[PDB]
Amino acid sequence: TATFTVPDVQKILDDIKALAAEQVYKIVKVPSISFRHIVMQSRDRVLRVDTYYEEMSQVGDVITEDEPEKFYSTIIKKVRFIRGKGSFILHDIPTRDHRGMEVAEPEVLGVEFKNVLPVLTAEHRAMIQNALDGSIIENGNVATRDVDVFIGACSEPVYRIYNRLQGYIEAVQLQELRNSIGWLERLGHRKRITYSQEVLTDFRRQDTIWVLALQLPVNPQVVWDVPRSSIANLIMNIATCLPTGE
Amino acid sequence: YIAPNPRISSITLTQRITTTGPFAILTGSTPTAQQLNDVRKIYLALMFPGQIILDLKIDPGERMDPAVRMVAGVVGHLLFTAGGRFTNLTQNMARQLDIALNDYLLYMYNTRVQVNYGPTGEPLDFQIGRNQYDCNVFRADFATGTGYNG
Amino acid sequence: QRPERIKTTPYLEGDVLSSDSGPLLSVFALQEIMQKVRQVQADYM
Amino acid sequence: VYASELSVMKVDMRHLSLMQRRFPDVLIQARPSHFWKAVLNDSPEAVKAVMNLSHSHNFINIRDMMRWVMLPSLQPSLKLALEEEAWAAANDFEDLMLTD
Amino acid sequence: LLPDLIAGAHQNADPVVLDVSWISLWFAFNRSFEPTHRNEMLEVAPLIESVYASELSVMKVDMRHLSLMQRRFPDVLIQARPSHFWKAVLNDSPEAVKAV
Amino acid sequence: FINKRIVERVRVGQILAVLNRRFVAYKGKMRIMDITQSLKMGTKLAAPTV
Amino acid sequence: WATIDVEYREPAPYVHAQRYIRYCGIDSRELINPTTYGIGMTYHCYNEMLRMLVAAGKDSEAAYFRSMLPFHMVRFARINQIINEDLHSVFSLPDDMFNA
């Protein structure tokens, strides 16, 4: 005794375990700029330019009518670029105070106009300042947690992704974490495994927002819908759960 | 801290003949630093009823003989309280203790006895012995505290 | 001097293992409470 | 992780299947194997390997892949929901800055 | 404490959770705690309680009197927050109370 | 011809007229952490043996 | 021969597989001690084989099998435990195909 699985499957499981730790979202203080402004010799009129289309026009290859694979790859890459740009979370935004209310700083709004102020006149400068003073922050609740709610500017295709991500975060805060933990407890009871819950039991647990990239009660049907996949499932089961003995 | 009298678990009838305790392997052990710290934690949790709550710790490298877990399953039901007024342990640790007690009761290293299982899959849902003793009463229920002190 | 501490039968008499007091246990509790949260915040992003 | 990756592949194939009908002038000489190979070029190699454990000695063709794509079963996750919303947002190709 | 723990609601005084091992149960079952002497400052504690309570009372009074300045004179305290006078009061208090 | 508003000419009074998106931010004193890797932390019970 | 080698019980962690393998009618719920487990346990086929061997004049072989019975029982108990408590996964075969 003092003196196993085939290596390629071991490499496969190692690669899957590595891929499980990839990070998709980001945590930022301010959103990226969606609208910028071009100044002319004038003092009353400027050009509002949407940066989304300007950045979007430089992604992918040219379309040609006799390489279908390149066309499909270009579409895939463009969609992935949209998905990657649209996913972020806000945390610790800048704030100012005014007459007992909270006001968002101009840098957290999704517009850039720092280069149009020097050309303005007095009346327009006063008007802009008074308008900026009217962005009141509202206190809201997300699963009994205090959050800030304000109004900013963003392009539509990336705003849809952001809104969906926020909905998913709210959903996993409400019920998904409890379902995952309960299913893990039942599985450990069945297979004689003790699962730790130390991460949820510190003294700062009443002011934490939990994010999960995966859910535990996995639907088995999607595994068995792959065409002619019995032998692969058998090999995976052997490589994952077979013990060793004498 | 005062240890119990060594003569409680053993009687020496004569020079060669002495009775043997069941847990003699455990009584010979000596705690390390971490185990002593855990003992201090347990007593601190006992002395303040509702303000400190215990929980189970998992260390992958740490290694003991499986008998320790099933003995602790019996011990915890007699040491702690999960009754209808206050608690000393989290719901998760209560479930772990119930599972440990189930494993201890179903482990029969002597002549086996009759057992009848129940319709549900919950732990301790069975009847044991020649006189059918219902063991459903030892499962934790925080609204009434059946399984523990109180 | 207290009637509760009078022992008349060797049933309650045994060896001495360790000792502890208030000024030690308070700082021990604080150390454990802070160490747990530091470990949790170190192990995860 | 395996279920999530399979779901992402299914969603991508399901949305790419309609391109030839949408634009006849560009994809006049395309075949389903083209977009099949295009999707497989962006999937992780681990899932492809897991499938190849079975597909190395069992034969499949376009019909099997289409029947698997049309089946209504997905594993919800962050990446899957984000990908579905990305496809929904990019439904209009004027938002992708290419036109005729 | 207990119904809130069962229902999972918000708690003003959240219990502190500590982790123990399996063998610690057996070691704790075979021990007893026998007190020998009272605490060193058991006879002094009520004076400490009274001093602490008095200092917190005077801090509360100062903060309550300062909280109305914004409503009395709006034009001077435009950028005021409660945390400002919180820090202002705490900067002029004994260090022992803040340390507690 | 593209039916999008890529570039427009606006007066200075319309600069802040694009604020129509509801943004939700989390407080700076709270914390956010990812606990996906915490779903694999467990220990395996060993059966008794001779 | 006459046993119930598969059984259905409370819901499993994975809903596509609910069966319980019960080789020789051994229940897998309880832990076993290999030193003394199968002292007085038999099943149908073993008894029929022993009876036939005795009726056929092979006394030594019948006695050998009667002595080796506890080894057989503990081996099949271990196999049942491994099947039911270790090989449970999404990769396990669904019931509607296992029955077919």
The DSSP secondary structure of A180-237, one letter per residue, reads HHHHHHHHHHHHTEEEP-GGG-STTGGGEEEE-S--SS--SHHHHTSTT-HHHHHHHH
CB A52 within 8 A of CB A34: yes
Taking contacts as CB-CB distances below 8 angstroms, the residues of chain F near C45 are 33-34
Q: Strand, coil or helix: what is G74?
A: helix
Burial letters A102-119, b for 16+ CB under 10 A, else e: bbbebebbbbebeebeee
Chains that touch G (3 or more CB pairs under 8 A): A, B, F
Which tokens is D38 given?
């295009």
Paired with A97 in beta bridges are A102
Tokens of A140: 């809201």
> In this complex, is the C-beta atom of A203 within 8 Å of any C-beta atom belonging to chain D?
no
Mark yes or no for CB contact E31/C17 under 8 Å. Answer: yes
- Asked whether at least 3 C-beta pairs link E and F within 8 Å, the reply is no
Q: How far is residue E26's CA from residue B105's CA, in Å, rounded to a whole number? A: 18
Residue with tokens 């499980």: A20
For residues F32 and A211, the answer to whether their CB atoms sit within 8 Å is: yes
Burial state string for G47-63 with b = 16 or more CB within 10 A and e = fewer than 16: eeebeebeeeeeeeebe
Tokens 């402004």 found at? A37
Q: Which residues contact G89 (CB under 8 A, 6 or more apart)?
A: A237, A240, A241, G14
Residue linked to tokens 């909270």: A102
Asked if E21's CB is within 8 angstroms of B62's CB, the reply is yes
Torsion on CA atoms E21, E25, E30, E32, rounded to nearest 10: 90
CB contact under 8 A, B95 and A185: yes
Q: Is D10 exposed, middle or buried (0-12, 13-18, 19+ CB in 10 A)?
A: buried
The count of other CB atoms within 10 Å of the CB of residue F7 is 12
Contact B120 G10 (CB under 8 A): yes
G82 Cβ contact list (under 8 Å, min separation 6): A243
Which residues fall within 8 angstroms of residue B37, CB to CB, at 6 or more apart?
Answer: C28, C32
- Backbone torsions φ then ψ of D61, nearest 5 degrees: -140, -165
Residue type, E18: L
Q: Quick one: which of E27, A77, C13, D11 has its CA closest to B72?
A: E27
The pair of structure tokens assigned to A4 is 């196993």
Burial class (CB in 10 A: 0-12, 13-18, 19+), F50: exposed
Distances (CA, A) of D56 to A10, A228, D59: 18, 11, 8
**Interface touch A222/D83, C-beta < 8 Å:** no
Touching chains F and A? (3+ Cβ pairs < 8 A):
yes
Sequence-ordered list of residues with C-beta below 8 angstroms from that of A150, at least 6 positions apart, any chain: A93, A104, A108, A135, A136, A137, A138, F23, F25
Closest CA in chain E for residue B90: E17
- The helix or strand, by DSSP H or E, that contains position A98, with its residue range, turns out to be strand A95-98
CB contact under 8 A, F35 and C41: no
**Chain A residues lying within 8 Å of F28, measured CB to CB:** 91-93
Which chain C residue shows the shortest CA-CA distance from E37?
Answer: C21
Whether the Cβ atoms of residue B60 and residue E42 lie closer than 8 Å to each other: no
Residues A164, A167, A169, A174: what is their CA dihedral angle, to the nearest 10 degrees? -160
Neighbours of D17 (CB within 10 A): 15
Longest dimension (CA), chain C: 60
DSSP string, B44-111: HHHHSTTTEEEEE---TT----THHHHHHHHHHHHH-B--SS--SB-HHHHHHHHHHHHHHHH--SSS
What amino acid is encoded at B141 in this protein? D
> Using CA atoms, how far apart are residues B88 and B55, in angstroms rounded to an integer?
9
Q: CA nearest A23: which of A84, A103, A110?
A: A84
Tokens of F24: 């939700």
Output the furthest CA–CA distance in chain B (Å, rounded). Answer: 54
Taking each helix axis from N to C end, the angle separating D2-16 and A68-85, rounded to the nearest 10 degrees, works out to 120
DSSP category for residue G93: P
Cβ proximity of D6 and D75 under 8 Å? yes
Q: E11 contacts in B (CB within 8 Å)? A: none
Residue F42 buriedness (CB in 10 A; 0-12 / 13-18 / 19+): middle
Question: Per DSSP, what are the bridge partners of residue B81?
Answer: B149
Q: Which helix (H) or strand (E) holds G79?
A: helix G59-85
Query: H-helix or E-strand containing G59?
Result: helix G59-85
**C-alpha torsion sign, points B125, B126, B128, B130:** positive
Q: Which helix (H) or strand (E) holds E20?
A: strand E16-20
Q: How far is CA A165 from CA A103, A157, D1, D78, in A?
A: 25, 13, 19, 8
CB contact under 8 A, F27 and A149: no
Query: Residue E22: which of B34, B72, B86 has the nearest Cβ?
Result: B72
The type of residue at B16 is: R
Q: Which of G15, G18, G31, G85 should one mutate to test binding to chain B, selecting the residue with the greatest count of B CBs within 10 A?
A: G31
Residue type, A235: I
Distance from CA of D18 to the nearest CA of A (A): 12
Residue A61 phi, psi (nearest 5): -105, 170
Nearest to E39 among C17, C22, C36 (CB): C22
Method of structure determination? cryo-EM
Interstrand relation of E16-20 and B52-56 (parallel, antiparallel or unpaired)? parallel
Instruction: Establish if E19 touches chain B: CB-CB under 8 angstroms.
Output: yes
Give the residues across from G8 on adjacent strands.
Answer: G19
Q: Please say whether the beta carbons of A188 and A195 come within 8 A.
A: yes
For residue A196, give the nearest of B58, B99, B123 by CB distance. B58
Using CA atoms, how far residue D5 sits from A55, A96, B66, D75, in Å, is 28, 44, 39, 9
Amino acid identity of residue E64, one-letter, is: R
Interchain touch D–B (≥3 Cβ pairs closer than 8 Å): no
Q: Which residue in the set F41, F45, F48 is minimally distant from B67, CB to CB?
A: F48
| CB atoms inside a 10 Å sphere around CB G10 | 11
